[PDB]
Design a protein around this ligand. Structure first.
Ligand SMILES: Nc1ncnc2c1ncn2[C@@H]1O[C@H](COP(=O)(O)OP(=O)(O)OP(=O)(O)O)[C@@H](O)[C@H]1O
Ligand SMILES: Nc1ncnc2c1ncn2[C@@H]1O[C@H](COP(=O)(O)OP(=O)(O)OP(=O)(O)O)[C@@H](O)[C@H]1O
Ligand SMILES: Nc1ncnc2c1ncn2[C@@H]1O[C@H](COP(=O)(O)OP(=O)(O)OP(=O)(O)O)[C@@H](O)[C@H]1O
Ligand SMILES: Nc1ncnc2c1ncn2[C@@H]1O[C@H](COP(=O)(O)OP(=O)(O)OP(=O)(O)O)[C@@H](O)[C@H]1O
Ligand SMILES: Nc1ncnc2c1ncn2[C@@H]1O[C@H](COP(=O)(O)OP(=O)(O)OP(=O)(O)O)[C@@H](O)[C@H]1O
Ligand SMILES: Nc1ncnc2c1ncn2[C@@H]1O[C@H](COP(=O)(O)OP(=O)(O)OP(=O)(O)O)[C@@H](O)[C@H]1O
Ligand SMILES: Nc1ncnc2c1ncn2[C@@H]1O[C@H](COP(=O)(O)OP(=O)(O)OP(=O)(O)O)[C@@H](O)[C@H]1O
Ligand SMILES: [Mg+2]
Ligand SMILES: [Mg+2]
Ligand SMILES: [Mg+2]
Ligand SMILES: [Mg+2]
Ligand SMILES: [Mg+2]
Ligand SMILES: [Mg+2]
Lengths: 456, 458, 452
């Protein structure tokens, strides 16, 4: 089969099923600021630092000094690698005031530094004539047995692969970087279009730029901090579960999240809250009016609240920020209030990808996850979520209003509990200064789940 | 690693995380009338006035005197800066240039340069590429920070003109002027900053005090009155001073009456109240309000009440938001009302509407101003939704007004549906409208299906 | 009359009704990485290995060493065929080229020729001159051409397709963020062919309603359900278990897999919602040891995320797992996870494809569907696949005296009597215990009944 070398770019070696085909050129194509120079630098940097494989970077516009200065923001010390004879940056930029000769310089540098990896950025800038030129360069690098990245420009996100509609047909390997405007938000994706003679995953995969390009179960029980709800769940929530609290505006979801967080903290565990609707001040005032002291928990270093606006960032960026804070603070409990705030004005496919990411990540770290969903219908709603994420969750707590004798009551139901028995009751509950008080089912009523029951 | 210098353009140093990379070119591209020359002038003006950094402005078309005259509409006095040798405008217009720019950078000790516009010179895409590279390289050599402005024909087509400029520059900024139905919406995007961080995608802005690009709020237990005794008891002692109140229900239920009481009660405590009315004139508002003994005309001429009447269709949402922000800043209300959010929502995208609501509500809470917003529902009975715009979760207290068919007549009932941080009455209370205003009575304890609008007596 | 020579590329000879017109040029057009070189190579490889017909491969860019090394990934040993003088790779990396092609054809007595690729007004006469010379020599020719677009010009210059007697378009289409491979036979002058696009995958080269039906019964693994279905599921059937989140679809899957393995039969599960760990834990609550059944080699579970591959590629994985493991029983948990954010037409082709493969292999299929509406649903599935299935189990929530109860109906049962009851069931430690219908209620199917 066709042998591959690891890029060690995070997630890339998975989508390429091993890395880039050894001894061949890969075209990396994309619009301006897609991450082309980034991929090309990371390739050489990882080659040297992880595999002691020397590298040539050929630039046709940017100055060596600018390549080195840019890489500093990632903590990559390119100058050190130059001083060790591991990295050579070959300046092929034009005069501030041909072809055969360039191919000869690159060969001298390859043999002198004993380089196995080469990046060229960008061959677009040194330009049927284009076709034969990429072919000649690619031919000589193959003969010398190096693995090459050639970056190309493009103007349109979903039009031609490169610029002259020829490059991709010459290259054995084609990677496309995209930066797609989804409404007013940008979404970064990598695609492996083609790898001759070998396998790769197909279509677009999300990625972020942070630190370079970035593409188990148990019977253990854990408390909600509501005594009666623990009973209703069969002895409590599972430690390795995703919990969904869903229902109409004002029902009591933020109350249930408050109790979840506080309970982990009084067991001396850390809890992490991502709030997308309310400020820290308001969360704390409301919480104090339920008998919960978020301020004391915060002082003791047990509770961290991250407040952010959904429409401030793209979903992939929200997920990266979530992964970073978990890796840093190392919680045993994570809460999202609300998933429905993050779903507003985004494709359901983008949102479902986000939800699969957050929940996958929580279940890998064996973190207990509590997520809220506010329904659009305040009554008579025949669905758990409008985003159809039900099948991604282990436990579902249905909160709903019920008209009783001319007043708006409210009931709680453990709708789903994978792995355990649960109470089937639609149990009336009351909110007070002590938080949630759960009472009995409405025995002598029909049509409770409609919101407008009838006395039997 | 890459250091930035402050632009002090309102909101830009936030999306750039500190401003523009020092010692490099930033491309600012846009269609005609997007704010490019404005951005270029403001970079130099703020450099001089705020950090004593001198600047060169290169024009290839516009006269110096027209650049100076145009800045005076923002109260920027460029001539005094030119008198002091802190600003120099280089006329490169029709009846090499690198030579002249470098002479001026030395002579004025300039650390900031604006070139407006680099398109007007440019023929071959290879010609423009090599030309923009040489200019950028010579300016970087001198150690100055540059903005080069560029033209485009399309809002979502090429970054620039020859599909090459954006690849040469270290830094690209796109100013857009999008037609959304018949309304224009200005946005700014940092596409790329080599070697550093930036916020991604488009941010709304307006042009008022130059370019103006626009969850850490306070929260108290302080109560304020609604002007309706029984409603204050239903809300557990009053509205919260730090809250957003939504009054929602079908046409004619009594939302505007509840706004009139909210505002009247503030003035009665000698506080300023501010009303934005998108459906009715001052004269109609005043006549209807006098039905309850409220004299809006006396409250206006004594400077306690200010009523702003406008049609939603007369401006884009971002410009409505600008008028609300500056009216709150001038008049300094304790209470602000919008009548109605439903009026502003029609024939605009849900995404742009929710952006507007986050913005007005977020700014009211920031300044600890009590906000009261109305929403008229499209279904006058049997509605299973609070709003069709789904803004419920952005509001703290929700008042639901509804019609209820009783004995072949249309009665109305009021419910405190939601009250963050307090107990509230759960009753669906019948009310009647008379000269006393809203008279709230008992819930209908003998009926089922009240919330459907067509009850059944048991 | 036009005669065809067989390609023996899986599925090509059916859509072409025999193969490629003999003695003529077929144009194979596509964007980059559509399978053009793969097609041109397979044509020659299949000719030499199956029909002993010598071939010439003419390359204008790729080196012979690359073509040979690339073909090794499928275990096609092109070197041994070159060493036997059955294959010649002509390196052209126009009058002069035709000379060497003629000489080669004569020297090797070749009937098949691939030219890859001819892209590397004047083109029209060039392609015509080339196609003409090969027609006089009696060879059947593949000519590969490059496109810029998926639904734009057939080739590059807007003439190649008008000169060729036969045109084939390979597409690699972006549907949301997933790629879908299709082959279309646009035209074959002087003969018949199937019309429009046909799905394919690259697995062993290019891979592009008449089954048996017995009265043999198999157990659901739940006694009462076997009686409700009139003595068990049919061996030759597709079972759809459909209903709201948490009704017990996965429990029914676990029973159906277990009872198979406990008879010494192999079962295969495709899981798209839950990990092996969560599946095993939940299953061990009802006394099922998936790990043990796997250990004994009677169970195999495949866990994947829907969003990870396209549906053509999921269907390929399912077909190769069945071919390898040879199950009596197969489960998909769930079809609703696969339907999310793909087109309904794409989803339906996937369903017809997987049900057709189970049915022609005599494999009992058990698929789950979760309904979006948890109560009062007027439909079996939102995707409307009911008519592709033989047995339908409807699981639904029923409000009884302020509590959420559960009911099961055998809704359809092609070929057999079935119970008409909407029967209450409870999930306990013993699994699913099915009880009686609510005979004193009205509107049970609404989920909010009234006591009569
Ligand atoms: N330290 C950093 N942290 C976060 N993001 C960064 C960092 N450094 C760079 N970036 C991001 O990476 C981008 C630079 O990508 P890169 O230089 O690879 O672009 P490119 O594809 O080569 O563009 P062009 O074709 O214009 O040269 C910046 O636009 C920025 O968004
Ligand atoms: N001190 C209190 N006494 C009684 N009830 C209270 C008290 N404080 C809050 N509540 C109740 O809690 C409700 C708010 O609960 P919570 O914030 O958890 O709702 P939610 O479902 O998160 O709503 P949303 O997300 O739509 O804002 C109030 O509307 C009120 O009914
Ligand atoms: N004093 C002012 N108050 C409010 N808006 C103003 C004021 N002065 C200018 N503007 C707005 O700014 C616009 C001009 O911005 P600017 O001159 O930067 O455009 P530009 O992008 O440079 O256009 P062109 O490419 O045609 O030169 C005016 O069309 C007007 O809408
Ligand atoms: N003098 C009055 N006496 C009694 N009822 C009155 C009087 N004036 C107005 N009303 C009642 O108040 C209603 C108007 O109240 P208001 O303007 O607040 O309604 P609204 O919900 O804001 O209406 P819209 O949907 O048109 O904006 C009338 O339809 C009527 O029922
Ligand atoms: N052994 C293999 N197993 C699986 N997939 C493979 C294998 N070898 C090749 N592929 C797939 O086939 C593709 C190669 O197709 P092919 O070489 O025919 O492309 P093409 O249409 O000729 O493109 P171009 O015109 O750029 O040369 C790769 O992109 C990869 O997706
Ligand atoms: N040990 C147990 N004892 C009693 N009931 C249990 C037990 N374990 C699970 N359950 C019940 O079984 C349900 C889970 O069944 P199952 O996982 O098959 O549902 P599903 O229809 O596949 O759900 P989903 O929609 O999540 O795929 C729980 O919600 C609960 O009602
Ligand atoms: N031997 C039998 N005894 C009793 N009922 C039977 C028997 N065979 C079939 N049935 C009944 O006939 C039904 C199938 O009838 P038929 O296939 O004609 O339905 P259909 O409406 O065409 O269904 P589809 O939607 O699948 O096309 C079974 O669900 C069952 O009710
Ligand atoms: Mg670059
Ligand atoms: Mg909440
Ligand atoms: Mg201008
Ligand atoms: Mg009104
Ligand atoms: Mg090829
Ligand atoms: Mg399941």
């Amino acid at each position: 089969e066709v042998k591959k070398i690891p890029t060690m770019i995070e997630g890339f070696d998975d989508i390429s099923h091993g890395g880039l085909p050894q001894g061949r050129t890969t075209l990396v194509s994309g619009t301006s600021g897609t991450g082309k120079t980034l991929f090309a630098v990371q390739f050489l940097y990882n080659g040297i630092t992880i595999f002691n494989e020397p590298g040539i970077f050929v630039t046709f516009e940017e100055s060596p000094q600018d390549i080195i200065k840019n890489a500093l923001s990632f903590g990559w010390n390119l100058q050190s690698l130059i001083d060790q004879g591991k990295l050579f940056i070959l300046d092929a930029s034009p005069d501030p005031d041909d072809l055969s000769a360039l191919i000869e310089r690159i060969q001298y540098a390859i043999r002198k530094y004993k380089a196995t990896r080469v990046s060229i950025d960008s061959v677009t800038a040194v330009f049927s004539v284009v076709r034969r030129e990429i072919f000649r360069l690619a031919f000589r690098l193959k003969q010398l047995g190096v693995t090459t990245i050639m970056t190309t420009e493009r103007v349109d996100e979903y039009g031609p692969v490169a610029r002259f509609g020829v490059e991709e047909f010459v290259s054995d390997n084609v990677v496309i970087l995209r930066n797609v405007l989804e409404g007013e938000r940008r979404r970064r994706t990598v695609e492996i279009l083609k790898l001759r003679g070998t396998t790769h995953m197909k279509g677009e995969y999300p990625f972020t730029i942070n630190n370079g390009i970035n593409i188990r179960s148990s019977n253990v029980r854990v408390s909600s901090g509501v005594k009666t709800l623990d009973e209703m769940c069969g002895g409590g929530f599972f430690k390795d579960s995703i919990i969904l609290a869903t229902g109409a505006t004002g029902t009591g979801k933020t109350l249930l999240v408050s109790k979840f967080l506080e309970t982990g903290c009084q067991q001396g565990e850390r809890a992490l809250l991502f709030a997308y609707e309310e400020s820290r001040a308001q969360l704390s005032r409301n919480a104090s009016s339920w008998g919960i002291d978020f301020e004391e928990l915060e002082r003791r270093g047990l509770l961290r609240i991250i407040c952010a606006y959904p429409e401030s960032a793209g979903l992939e960026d929200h997920l990266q920020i979530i992964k970073s804070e978990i890796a840093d603070f190392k919680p045993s409990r994570v809460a999202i209030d609300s998933l429905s705030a993050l779903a507003r004005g985004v494709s359901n496919n983008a949102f479902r990808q986000f939800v699969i990411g957050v929940t996958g990540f929580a279940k890998q770290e064996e973190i207990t996850g509590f997520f809220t969903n506010t329904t659009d219908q305040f009554m008579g709603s025949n669905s758990i979520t409008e985003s159809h994420i039900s099948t991604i969750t282990d436990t579902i707590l249905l909160l709903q209003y019920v008209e009783i004798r001319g007043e708006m009551s409210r009931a709680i139901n453990v709708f789903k509990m994978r792995g355990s028995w649960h109470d089937k009751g639609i149990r009336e509950y009351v909110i007070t200064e002590k938080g949630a008080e759960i009472r009995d089912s409405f025995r002598n009523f029909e049509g409770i789940i409609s919101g407008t029951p009838t006395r039997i």
